[PDB]
Amino acid sequence: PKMKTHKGAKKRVKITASGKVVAMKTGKRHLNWQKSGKEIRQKGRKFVLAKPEAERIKLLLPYE
Amino acid sequence: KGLAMAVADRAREGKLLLVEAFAGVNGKTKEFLAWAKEAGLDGSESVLLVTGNELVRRAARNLPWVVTLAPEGLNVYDIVRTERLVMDLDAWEVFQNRIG
Amino acid sequence: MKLSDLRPNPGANKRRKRVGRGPGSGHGKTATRGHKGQKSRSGGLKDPRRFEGGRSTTLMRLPKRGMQGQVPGEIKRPRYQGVNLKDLARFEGEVTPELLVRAGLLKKGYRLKILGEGEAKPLKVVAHAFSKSALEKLKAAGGEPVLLE
Amino acid sequence: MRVKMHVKKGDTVLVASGKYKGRVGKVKEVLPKKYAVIVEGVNIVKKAVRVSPKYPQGGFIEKEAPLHASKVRPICPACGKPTRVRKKFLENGKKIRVCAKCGGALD
RNA sequence: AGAUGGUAAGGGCCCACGGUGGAUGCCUCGGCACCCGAGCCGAUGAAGGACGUGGCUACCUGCGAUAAGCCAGGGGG
RNA sequence: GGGGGGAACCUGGGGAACUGAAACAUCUCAGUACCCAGAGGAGAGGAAAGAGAAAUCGACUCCCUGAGUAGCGGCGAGCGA
RNA sequence: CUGUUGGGAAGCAGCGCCAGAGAGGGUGAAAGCCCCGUAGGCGAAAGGUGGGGGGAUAGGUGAGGGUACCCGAGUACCCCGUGGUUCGUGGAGCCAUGGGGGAAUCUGGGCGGACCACCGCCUAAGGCUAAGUACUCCGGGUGACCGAUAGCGCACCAGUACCGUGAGGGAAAGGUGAAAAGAACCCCGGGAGGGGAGUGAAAUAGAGCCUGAAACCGUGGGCUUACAAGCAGUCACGGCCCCGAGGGGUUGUGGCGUGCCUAUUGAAGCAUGAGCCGGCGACUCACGGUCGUGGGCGAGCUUAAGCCGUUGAGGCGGAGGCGUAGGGAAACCGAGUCCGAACAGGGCGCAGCGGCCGCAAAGUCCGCGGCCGUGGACCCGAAACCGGGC
RNA sequence: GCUGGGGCUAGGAGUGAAAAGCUAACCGAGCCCGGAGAUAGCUGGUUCUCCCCGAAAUGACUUUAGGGUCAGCCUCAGGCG
RNA sequence: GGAUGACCCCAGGCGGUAGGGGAGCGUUCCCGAUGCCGAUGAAGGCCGACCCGCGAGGGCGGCUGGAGGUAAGGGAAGUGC
């Protein structure tokens, strides 16, 4: 039967035009009071997942 | 493209022959047989005969060296299986519309 | 050209790999599976795209983001597809959404928005939207922007 | 529904194949289950018989061996040639076998 | 003094021919799949059975004390 | 008139567990297996107190597609209009 | 049809013929013309069907105006408990309903995802309804389906023998020959069995029957062996025997030499498995994905279900899918966009060869191959768990 | 007390002067058929030939430790040079 | 070198478990085939000190067998113990 889109990945991640995989930096969900502003700010960006980890996530998204 | 190439291949060999009509063939094998001899088909070479004339297909079908088809049925396995291609103009007409 | 002559081009039809058929093949006994463990077993491993041996997975440690939607689902709103000026080059006279659908440029169910990559051509282009630069290039090349609503 | 038999007891048949190809004879018997006929004096075999009341002195008898019905062809009683059969409908109209070479009935 | 061959109770290898056994090939009354067709039976006692039934009849088939069958129509020769 | 039978198919009334979740309870397996009742050559459904945004369509059934979309989900495994 | 070889002609040879029939099966071997068929035609007194054609019958059919009589009740509706839906308590509507409460008759009511308004949609609480759909006990047709360890459990007297109190389990077992011509009679023997005779093209086709492998048992022959130390061979030489400057068989002496498989750091290993032989026996298929690859077309590529045709003929079908633009949670903007006060900085994006022609290419479709996902997913194996019965 | 015949109670159930005894020759949960090809990160087994290359037994993390994910190390195809 | 995988010449590499890759052999079936081989003997069996091939194998001969078999080139798998 056809493959299913993994909804947890669909909800965390985006495949960019050239097929990199992009996600939010981890670590500002909470426990933030003593984090510097450099930290909070930088954790506010997206990052490009390491190739082996991205290639795996990509196969979970067969129809994006 | 396949259809067209197959007909093209027989054409390039001289083995494709177009005909206006079929003399006296009115549904009898010996009638087609006569006409054939006269048309250069001694039966030493297998023939894919394509025509909408039912009366002509019945006359020829039983001959071991003849495969018959309506023009809507022209297909490459049959062209490639046989040594010579023989067509009605009316047949040749539909084939031209199909490869368009 | 006869039946005995019909061949696939080299490489067009490759042989399959057969395992577990003898030593000379170099794929006998273990059938290229190595020795023992889960992956050698019939049924094999867990989905290697996700599973990581029991530790929290790479994917599941990344944060979710944005609106995921709620029952009763997607909210119906007009959707726009852009098609650039350069794609309009091929037409002469008029362009309308319907035409662009036919040519295979605009997908059905999307409204038309014209965009600015390329040069404008003095055509009457009818559409639901224009970008700033599309409007400019078109007005400048003497073409006629018509807005649908 | 019935085995088809082109030949019957006892019209006259040419034995057209086998060791006895060429012989002519009356069909003594038709055996439809085996699809076979007995033709008079054709396919003779030697059979052993025990010294018995039926056969004191014992020794052997000659028996006619059945032939596959397809080996046999009726001889037309009009023209005298071996023939295939055709059927013809009469005015009754019963149907009959007729020689296929000339037109004659074969009974 | 010295030295070297013919022994085979039996055994071993090879060859020949057999016995056992039933592979292999060929074969097909049978099976399998798909497609088409067709689709209810029963108190007017079904499905499915028991016991019978032949001049001689173990079983199977058929049949039911009218018992490998009774009457009539059609087919066939 | 009913009763009883019929290989699958069908509707209705009931309805598991292994397993999967690399443990497990919600979840899955699955309204499946299976029991029961009933129908029939099919059964069910069917002529809008519908759909759901089109100023629209127009009973029901069944196939393709819409779409693994929308969503649902110890937002896990998965489930899925 | 004839000739010919042959047990047999359908083989080979000579000369013919049919074909809307050269599908296929038989006949003593290999047959268009011998048989059964095949193409093309024909056919029902009786019973069944009859969705097609015809006929009948039931049944159907108006407009203003007024009246406010009727328009499905323990129902709607609300609350509580649940189920159904993609919806697992969620912002949880809708449909259904076990408990409680409980209306109205169009100025009535239900619905459009809490709720409210507005704007629309629809008429609950009675019933029926062909067809298009599912299945295959049954009949037929057809296989890049099996061919007796296969294929149904059963080709055969099988749901049998047999096993089990019972539910229930559940086999093995096909082939003489063209034809029985199935071997009269004699001989040995109680018989079985054999030897002659006879049949047959063939009888090591003789019924314990086609072929008749291998393990296994034997008779006969060649070479060899009773002072010798062995994973059984191998290399060398010599002897003997055989077929005929060579080969084959055998093996006295000399040299060398730790079975196979499995699992292991490491096995000849005193670690697993295997008595031997034959046969059966384990990486596949569908659908999706990802790469590679052979082609087709290329800013485009491609059709699905179906419909027409065919009866091993293909065509139509553009609904839809992938691609042609990205960025952003989104509104939204767009070769950009997001963060930002920023025209700052940054993230993620954007930009063929030759001579208008050809050539290559995005991409996409089909084939092929590797690997992945979902399925039992390479085969075999639990102890267990659950349902219904005995 | 023993015994014949005729009866009743059964599977998380019976029955038990109690041994988890017995319930059709193996009962800490009977047997048959079914879910069913349960699951088995374990053991076993995995079948023609030739040619080229040719590892690992480490690190991180892991209800993980004889199982995995990534990296390391092998190999193929394309590119660079 | 010759132009192209025609073959010759010079040089170098060629131990290998897991494992990657390449090239082939053979089994069943389909197209090729209304053809071709076949009773002057099919398949299958038993021999062979012979021929070709690195090999898997393929030829050829004799005996058995008695009715089937199937090429060059391709296609598909219940394909090798």
Place this chain on the structure above:
RNA sequence: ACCCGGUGAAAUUGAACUGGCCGUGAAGAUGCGGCCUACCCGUGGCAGGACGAAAAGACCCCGUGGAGCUUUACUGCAGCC
């Protein structure tokens, strides 16, 4: 039990042309080294060895295996309030 006539099993079995010592070897050798010893084949007997046979160790550990049992483990259900 033994001998003669009659009938005639079994587990097990890679194959076997199956000696001793001292060593060696995956650490207890008929099978390797060196030596020693030994003509070929049985019958009745003995049990030291062939890590003899049988039984995929029951102890032990391991498996995110199973089951029976317990409780102020967790969660639920019957029952009762």
